[PDB]
């Protein structure tokens, strides 16, 4: 699902490459087949709001929101498993599930890093990707809920992912 890649990029630390490929993304969002017209609009609003900021200023807001705290962490297993040892085995089992689909970590991010996990989902058949979102949907909803409390438009990206889940 191109939508899953698109959200994966928008949910990551705002990279300069976002600004120089905004045209490509705006068009992909516009021609989206998996999102109703109103949600594609909301996603395009988000991208436009993001890339009218200077990346340095986008990066600073992102960190104030996702890198300062645990309640807004993008490591999924930090929301699933309370014991650190449980998280470990979960990460291993997720790494193996990646290896099963012929995918190998080529990053310095953890396996349950949501943007990374979305990249994995996007490689799957439609149904296989949709189940993935259903699997983490209580996490998606908590994060969205929390972001709304902080009155942050990143919540939009979680609602869109939840929408894609049904």
């Amino acid at each position: 699902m191109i939508e899953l890649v698109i959200v994966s990029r928008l949910l990551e630390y705002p990279d300069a490459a976002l600004w120089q490929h905004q045209q490509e993304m705006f068009e992909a969002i516009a021609a989206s087949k998996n999102l109703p017209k109103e949600d594609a609009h909301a996603l395009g609003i988000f991208l436009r709001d993001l890339t009218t900021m200077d990346p340095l200023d986008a990066q600073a807001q992102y960190s104030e929101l996702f890198d300062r705290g645990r309640a807004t962490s993008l490591l999924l297993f930090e929301h699933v498993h309370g014991e650190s040892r449980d998280r470990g085995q979960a990460m291993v089992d997720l790494l193996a599930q990646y290896e099963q689909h012929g995918l190998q970590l080529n990053s310095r991010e953890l396996p349950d890093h949501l943007p990374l996990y979305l990249e994995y989902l996007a490689q799957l058949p439609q149904s296989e990707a949709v189940e993935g979102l259903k699997d983490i949907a209580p996490i998606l909803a908590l994060l969205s809920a929390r972001l709304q409390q902080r009155e942050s438009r990143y919540a939009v990206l979680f609602d869109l992912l939840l929408k894609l889940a049904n």
Partner: peptide, 13 residues
């Protein structure tokens, strides 16, 4: 190559 078709976290085996 289109941006959205370039991997950012993974590679093939």
């Amino acid at each position: 190559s289109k941006f959205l078709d370039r991997f950012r976290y993974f590679k093939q085996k």
